[PDB]
Design a protein around this motif. Structure first.
Motif: not given
Length: 58
Positions: A2-6, A20-24, A31-38, A50-55
RNA sequence: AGUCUUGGAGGUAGAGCACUGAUUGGACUAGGGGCCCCUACCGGGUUACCGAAUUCAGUCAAACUCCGAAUGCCAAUGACU
């Protein structure tokens, strides 16, 4: 693995495809956070916006 | 719907002269009006023109192509919504 994306930047002023990609990915507020499988699909999604996201890999 | 993988039509950005021009550096200059002489003579060559070629480039092509991307389009499989 799992990894977090903010969401670190607002989507106002961005082309439609990036929005659309960000919403999907699941993010809806700044400043939200979510976890997904790599895997390769998630990495490609991150590469697109990638300029709007910190992993971070927990 | 978004992402990954596989498949597929395409002639532009570039580059280049294989084709068409553009042409010029200029050749190639025939062979003629004409020029030396004309032509009292036709023309030998320039042709000081035309222009048949041809000459080797140089580039050049919003209406040239032997060559040809990045992205976008059209379908197929896992994730993700």
């Amino acid at each position: 693995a799992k990894l977090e994306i903010t969401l670190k930047r607002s989507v106002i002023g961005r082309p439609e495809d990036q929005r659309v990609t960000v919403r999907t990915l699941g993010l809806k507020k700044t400043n939200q956070t979510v976890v997904h499988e790599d895997n390769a699909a998630i990495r490609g999604m991150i590469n697109k916006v990638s300029h709007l996201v910190s992993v971070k890999e927990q």
